[PDB]
Design a protein around this ligand. Structure first.
Ligand SMILES: Cc1cc2nc3c(=O)[nH]c(=O)nc-3n(C[C@H](O)[C@H](O)[C@H](O)COP(=O)(O)O)c2cc1C
Ligand SMILES: Cc1cc2nc3c(=O)[nH]c(=O)nc-3n(C[C@H](O)[C@H](O)[C@H](O)COP(=O)(O)O)c2cc1C
Lengths: 347, 347
């Protein structure tokens, strides 16, 4: 596998936007033998570029950069904004402009990634034109794309991508569906089932993602056909992670015992720890991304500033309670040991 | 493991009520090295007893019998019944009596199982009094209980059960939650995540269940800590399965491409292929089991008689599209080969 040939361990640190996966995190993962990732989501092409340069100065090993696919333009937003008036007053801040960018600097970011190629680039919220995949391939970059169904995985393969990331329903953060609709509600596929379906639907390498917190689960996905395992929440809790303290603390807090997929914070289905904001607005959140995301961004910033986890987007997979707080490099070592231990057991 | 010591292969054929798992199915599984299961759900103690005798004449190998835990008594039922008036008229049959038994012959069935012990007994919809577990243990019967969360699994262990069945959200048929409430809606845990959580929550053997259709997935759960894999949908499609033809046909029918958890047919969350009945009544089905089950039973019988899959409870796990139609014994052989193939790959 061209992908797994880049790094020794079948472990990928999921790109996590919002200041979570900073250069220091990716570097520690890379240096430990895994594939570190930078998140270009919500950053400017320049911001992304600065982190790429930063990381190259931290490690000479392969790493990835994740980018969001532009989203097409859509009454519901107006109603939701109204329902958030109380939040705005409480956090003493104005709601953001719902119409503040849908491309997320896609064109400028691609220019950067093509002018100064990185080892791996992944895409979320859809599939790039096959010309984009081809140009990146020519530049020597491996391409990955998330799929949540075997149909989406076939689309990833048809686009010429090098590998597909099979993200199960257990995953933390945003579901990487190529298109969001009310129908996806309750249609999420468990990773073990999605992995098997995707493996039989395409011939390209598969990276399993969703709820993976232990080396034994990594062995599990490998046994089921995956070439590697991508972990977000497990790394969110590490020291190098730039996730806010209230967010890291919530992962193992009994008061945040459960997670749920919701459009409350961004207008697109994303798994977060259940908190006040989710309980109050989740049932009425409309499918309007990134409109809703822009709308609530100021609210979330204010909540974070105050250290109030009840008003934050506590992205977390279903395995959050198993999060371990230690250096990312040491977590890779523990995962590697658990993986080896599980391998031996299976024989 | 006392459980896996009973049969050579780490494969369990899930008990499936409604005439699906008949003696011939269990026998073929047992004879192939797996653990065949009889379903006592909805049958009288006598009906269950006749199948047990039948099976003993078909195989001398270990098998299991599954029983439903009695359910406590609960306006909503009246409203749902009203909404089903059209179904009653269309299928030209009366709705069943919502108050037609909540114990499901529990006491009489236990008397039978204790007077003429079987190798394995499993429980669904809760946990038996620890005295029941103790008496069965003394009689030489191994006890299994389904859990859908680590909390429920701890309850299973505390009751003294020999093993817990970790049933993930991908599972077909009824979710084995110990108590049903609107809160369980959207709280389902993916099997790979549930398995890891349960493995760290209890010390007793774990049987993984939900979406398992291939030997590689069996290797996957073993790698993650399970002692065996329990498969329902995979066996539902075999020749020995007594599932109605329209039900077996629906599993791979593109027109029934998706599944969803619903209370439409029985008043308790159960995963079925999306069909007309589910689309129409699912959104309004109340949490009232087995009240709703009794209510719709006549409707489902009529639909089945007519071969109309749109009015049937098409129980199926998320891996239904991978169903294979062949003798159950041959399916065990294929699964065994896939398991071995996956083991080798992991090393
Ligand atoms: C903190 C949070 C932020 C995330 N940000 C991104 C992102 O910017 N781009 C992306 O492709 N995936 C993102 N993900 C999803 C991950 O790629 C991965 O699918 C998920 O973390 C898998 O679940 P666990 O989180 O591993 O259960 C994010 C997940 C979380 C936890
Ligand atoms: C046809 C249908 C009927 C079922 N009946 C029972 C039952 O009577 N008792 C029980 O404990 N589980 C029952 N199950 C659930 C199974 O024990 C198991 O959890 C499920 O089949 C696992 O998913 P797949 O179906 O293996 O994805 C049933 C499942 C389906 C498919």
């Amino acid at each position: 596998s061209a992908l797994t040939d880049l790094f020794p361990l079948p472990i990928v640190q999921a790109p996590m936007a919002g200041g979570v996966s900073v250069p220091q995190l990716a570097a520690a993962v890379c240096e430990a033998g895994g594939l570190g990732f930078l998140a270009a989501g919500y950053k400017t092409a320049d911001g992304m570029y600065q982190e790429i340069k930063r990381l190259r100065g931290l490690t000479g090993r392969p790493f990835g950069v994740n980018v969001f696919m532009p989203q097409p333009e859509l009454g519901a937003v107006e109603v939701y904004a109204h329902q958030l008036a109380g939040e705005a007053a409480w956090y003493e801040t104005e709601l953001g402009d719902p119409d503040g960018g849908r491309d997320d600097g896609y064109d400028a970011k691609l220019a950067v990634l093509l002018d100064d190629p990185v080892p791996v680039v992944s895409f979320h919220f859809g599939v790039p034109d096959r010309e984009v995949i081809a140009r990146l391939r020519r530049a020597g970059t491996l391409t990955l794309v998330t799929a949540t169904t075997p149909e989406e995985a076939r689309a990833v393969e048809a686009a010429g991508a090098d590998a597909v990331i099979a993200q199960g329903v257990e995953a933390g953060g945003h579901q990487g569906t190529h298109r969001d609709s009310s129908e996806d509600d309750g249609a999420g596929i468990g990773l073990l089932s999605l992995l098997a379906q995707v493996r039989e639907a395409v011939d390209i390498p598969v990276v399993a993602a969703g709820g993976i917190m232990r080396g034994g689960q990594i062995a599990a996905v490998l046994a089921a056909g995956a070439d590697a395992a991508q972990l977000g929440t497990a790394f969110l809790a590490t020291d190098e992670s730039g996730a806010p303290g209230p967010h890291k603390r919530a992962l193992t807090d009994p008061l945040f015992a459960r997670t749920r997929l919701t459009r409350a914070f961004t207008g697109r289905p994303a798994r977060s720890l259940v908190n006040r904001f989710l309980r109050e607005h989740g049932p009425y959140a409309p499918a309007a991304y990134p409109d809703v995301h822009h709308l609530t961004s100021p609210l979330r910033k204010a909540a974070a500033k105050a250290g109030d986890a009840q008003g934050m987007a506590l992205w977390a997979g279903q395995g959050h309670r198993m999060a371990r707080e230690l250096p990312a490099g040491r977590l890779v070592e523990v995962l590697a040991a658990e993986l080896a231990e599980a391998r031996t057991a299976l024989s």
